[model samples]
Target: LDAALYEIYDGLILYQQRLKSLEGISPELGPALDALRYDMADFAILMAQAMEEGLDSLPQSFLRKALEMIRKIQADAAALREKLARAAAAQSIARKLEEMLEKAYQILRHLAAA
Candidate 1:
């Protein structure tokens, strides 16, 4: 799990760095985003496997919400990819927005710990 998280974080960081280097949007951006998506998919799959392997108990409500969130991310990512075909500036902005959203997500988890 830790290794999966690390890979996901590292992937996102690399994706963001690549975006910073891009001028508006290049064909490279799609690959970069795809890399990030694959990393995240790995992370999520690892989590699901861990749940099975460890006999973890999550509240039904929480599990449902988590699945919903995952679906939303996939759908939005698809939308973003479609939009990328038509707009470079928008894709760049969305890439940065995703970075910010990830950071905020981490912060929220930190807050929940307290």
Candidate 2:
């Protein structure tokens, strides 16, 4: 679980960097993506603390609940990306981010199942 969490944190960091690069081209996507980045950063902190404090020892059910919430959040991102249609460049960026977010959720889901 610790390793998985770290992978997710690293993935989110890379995702944020890509989002930053798109800011200039898609000003509207900037604020929303920034908000998501902030939330993800906080989540990363939570994961770090969980590792340092040996909280990864928690039961599988608890972790499954968390993963479910993450999937929901990713689903929200997908919805937002869908609404971001009509702008070629912006939509492209949104679609990529949406795909990445979905992939992250899928990973978590698999982890939870394991």
Candidate 3:
């Protein structure tokens, strides 16, 4: 689980860096991109905390909220992908977002199972 969390963190970092480097993005798309970055970073932080304090220590309510947020981020990213179709970096970011969302979902599943 630690390894998986790290992989998700790295993917989110890479996506944010790559997204920032892309040129000619519209002003309208900027906020959405920023929100996506923030969401992924927050999710990563939560996972890191879970690792440090023990998953059982985190409340189920918090896990459910985080899971819902990831689902929303995934949907938002899908829309962003279509809007930024001309930007080459968007494709990579979209892929990373998908992976991170899946990892997040798995984390929630594990928590429920436990």
Best by lDDT: 3
- Quantify all predictions' global Cα lDDT against the true fold: 0.50, 0.62, 0.72
Q: List the residue pairs that clash in candidate 3.
A: none
| Model 1: per-residue Cα lDDT over 4-103, one tens digit each | 4444455544554554444445675566555545645554554455345442344445444444554455455556656566366656656664654355
lDDT accuracy of residue 77 in candidate 1: 53
Tell me the number of clashing residue pairs for each predicted model.
Answer: 0, 0, 0
**What are the TM-scores, per candidate, against the unseen true structure?**
0.36, 0.60, 0.78
Off by over 4 Å in 1: 1-55, 86-114
Candidate 2 local lDDT, 35-110, one digit each (tens):
7667666555555555666543656765665566566657656765765653576567667666666666665565
Worst 10 residues of 3 by lDDT: 16-25
Clashes counted in candidate 3 amount to: 0
C-alpha positional error of residue 90 in candidate 3 after TM-score superposition, expressed in Å? 2.4
Question: For model 3, how does the per-residue alpha-carbon lDDT over 1-114 read when each residue is reduced to its tens digit?
Answer: 656767776776777666675545678888887787787778767766767777667788877877787788788878887776756656776776676677767867777667
Better of 2 and 3 by TM-score: 3
lDDT of 2: 0.62
Give the Cα error of residue 31 in candidate 3, in Å. Answer: 1.6
What is the TM-score (0 to 1) of candidate 1? 0.36
Give the candidate number with the greatest TM-score: 3
Model 2 pairs whose backbones collide: none
The lDDT-based order of candidates, best leading, equals 3, 2, 1
